[PDB]
Nucleic acid binder design. Structure first.
Lengths: 91, 81, 77, 92, 94, 99, 79, 94
DNA sequence: GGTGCCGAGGCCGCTCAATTGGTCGTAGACAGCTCTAGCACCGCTTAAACGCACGTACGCGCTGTCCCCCGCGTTTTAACCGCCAAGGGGATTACTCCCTAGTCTCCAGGCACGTG
DNA sequence: CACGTGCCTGGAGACTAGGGAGTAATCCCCTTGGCGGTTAAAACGCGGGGGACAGCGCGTACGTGCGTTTAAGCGGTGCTAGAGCTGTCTACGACCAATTGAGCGGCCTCGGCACC
């Protein structure tokens, strides 16, 4: 029934569409834009959480902490390029 | 009235920050220069923060204004909104 | 990891600076914490570039000229 | 308005024996919102540049190629493309 | 179609009547004014969206000017803007 | 008189600035005072920049303002330089510093 | 010829002199060509995606101006 | 005499505003580097001019910044270490 | 100091965008109330800053070298300018049709709570 | 933090209806390609002199450590400023239809300048 189940994703296509409408980035928003944005956010979040989980396993902690997120972001060179001007609280 | 509180950034605090940064030895004149640099950056951020608060006709500088001012300065901030 | 500036002196510094722009202001603790984390990150980055400059000049002690050069190169002035 | 449940869902499917802390959820949520905002602003800028007032799949495929460089811009494109293509298959 | 050539020439004649504006300088200042207008407008849009308001009034576009033009020039520009808004408002003499 | 530029005593066109604000799509609605304030601000900015560029042209014994004089005006002044630091002006050159 | 040699030695010496330098070492030119080529890559890879989005087979000055604006080095004389 | 000529060259080129890269080699270079991303492309002469006048400005800024860190090290000769340090500090790359 | 060209400047026609007038729906100004969260104060104490002695790692000045850039004259190259062909794609217009805003139900999934 | 449980507002499906732009054909601007002259710039070679670098010694200021001071952090305790929410009214800004003159382009004048 839901568009997320249609696209085989987990991020909410409806929520991404609502955020796109509320942000007022253009007068009309296409139908495929929320699906594509949800897919890209899926891939990015999956990669970031994979790296953070690798860091947590290295630090032998079962929980993920903003320090682990900072290590994950600043260890991978490409994600470092994307988020180089970012400072994370308690990191 | 609060006066001469720039000295609240103590010499050991700047030393700890420098050791975290990666230095090994610090010259004696670095502390005053660092206090000046911190004061300049803090003025730049706080002016935009209080501008944001004035825009919303608020009297308390919300963290959602400081994060916006920092985003304006080019140094974003995650963990507060 | 850990805050390196003491909380109360930094809060008093922030209040003293902000009293110039708009008197009888108020700060909520989240804002002061955000400012502290941002300033600590900024100073750590500045001292990273300062150590780079000091190593460049065949030196191991960071000196005021190193901080000035790092700020001039980074753009801020 | 948060991605906390979706963050936990995506974590449990990649690292079974892991959990996300509240601060981690907050920073992840802010990061995802900022990334979405950046992509949306680039898409809207492109749409205005081309003298069109719709953000279609084209204006987002050609915006992630501007934000994410060739490391994943040639891969997150591939992951994104299957998503819009799969919707067409289910409709028929 | 959309430019500011005649107004640039008018301002230059008002300030430095003896001089004249070149085509390249006209283009550079046209782009400069467009860029400054875009920056002020987008900062005022951010300010409007920050307080859950969907309008960009004189208050928003004054706070954006103060926020994006720090220093003496910002105060002078804000004074000029308030003077212009007041001059417009004095046409409420009806 | 008529119009809004002459009503506020602004050389810059209030209506054109209003149209630009509408076309840029920065917010759903644009208030009445926003174009007036923005036209005044931009008029003052261009007045300052043109005065500085004309002074640079006079100091160069030149009666025509080219982009080089605009870059001299932008960089020599200590404030416009802050506002337009990351801006490259075509055929603008650089100030003579010789270290 | 890699055609990067079009940015020849005197064409870097003149540009550096405009920079303000007084003496240039012999190994500066290879690093300078590398810097120039990576900057050109970073700008062209955006000024080409802009045309590809506009469904155009040519690169215009407006696309390059937008690409330069994205990297933070705005250009004013064009568009 | 080892000096002097460099000083006059600096004074002449800083006062001037022309383009210091030969037009045709840069045009060929930009075509070659662009042909990788999308084959059979055409460039407006204005686009190549914009790219040239952006690359020259960036290179001259980088050379001023590397001169700063060369004189800072009690030298007058710029070396690849200086360029690498300037690019590292500016945040462009390593 | 003398000269030709070319880009800017002033006058007129006009049209298209700005202005004027009226309407209406709603976004927002505005008043009132609440509670929450920020401010000011109390004392303990103990981590942390601070003052001093000190030896030593290290900055900095002097000196020598040898080398690697600089300036300059020469030859080669390829860029710059004028000119022609051309056709490939940029930009418009006419049309329609198909995508999307808006609205009405209808329902579930994801938000919050409780639990061992 | 995971596994029931209740629940409710936002997401989804069906419909309408309306215009955004996708497609096609056409005009033609201009960007690619080529050729020829000519000539300024670049590549090469060489001598020479400044300066990059390494080494050595002096003195000097800094990290370490110890005793001293101090004020930050904790934990209440109390007070109230105002952030935030709600209810209600109205000034305003989007929108349309009619009117008109301000700025743009064509065209004729004329000084600024790059040149010798």
């Amino acid at each position: 029934k839901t568009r997320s189940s249609r696209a085989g994703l987990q991020f909410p296509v409806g929520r991404v569409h609502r955020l796109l409408r509320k942000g007022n980035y253009s007068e009309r928003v296409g139908a495929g834009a929320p699906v594509y944005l949800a897919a890209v956010l899926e891939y990015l979040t999956a990669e970031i959480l994979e790296l953070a989980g690798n860091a947590a396993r290295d630090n032998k902690k079962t929980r993920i902490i903003p320090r682990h997120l900072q290590l994950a972001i600043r260890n991978d060179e490409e994600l470092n390029k994307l988020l180089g001007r970012v400072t994370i609280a308690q990191g | 009235v609060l006066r001469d509180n720039i000295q609240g950034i103590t010499k050991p605090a700047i030393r700890r920050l420098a050791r975290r940064g990666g230095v090994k030895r610090i010259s004696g004149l670095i502390y005053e220069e660092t206090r000046g640099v911190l004061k300049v950056f803090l003025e730049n951020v706080i002016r935009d923060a209080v501008t944001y608060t004035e825009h919303a006709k608020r009297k308390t500088v919300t963290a959602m204004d400081v994060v916006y001012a920092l985003k304006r300065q080019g140094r974003t901030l995650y963990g507060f909104g | 990891t850990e805050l390196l500036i003491r909380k109360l002196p930094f809060q008093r510094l922030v209040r003293e600076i902000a009293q110039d722009f708009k008197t009888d202001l108020r700060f909520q603790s989240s804002a002061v914490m955000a400012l502290q984390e941002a300033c600590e990150a900024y100073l750590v980055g500045l001292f990273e570039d300062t150590n780079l400059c000091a190593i460049h000049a065949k030196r191991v002690t960071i000196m005021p000229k190193d901080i000035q050069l790092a700020r001039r190169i980074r753009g801020e002035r | 308005d948060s991605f906390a449940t979706y963050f936990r869902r995506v974590l449990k499917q990649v690292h079974q024996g892991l959990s996300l802390s509240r601060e981690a959820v907050s920073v992840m949520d802010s990061l995802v919102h900022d990334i979405l905002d950046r992509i949306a602003t680039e898409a809207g800028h492109l749409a205005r540049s081309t003298k069109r007032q719709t953000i279609t799949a084209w204006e987002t495929r050609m915006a992630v190629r501007l934000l994410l460089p060739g490391q994943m811009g040639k891969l997150a494109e591939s992951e994104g493309t299957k998503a819009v293509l799969r919707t067409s298959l289910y409709a028929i």
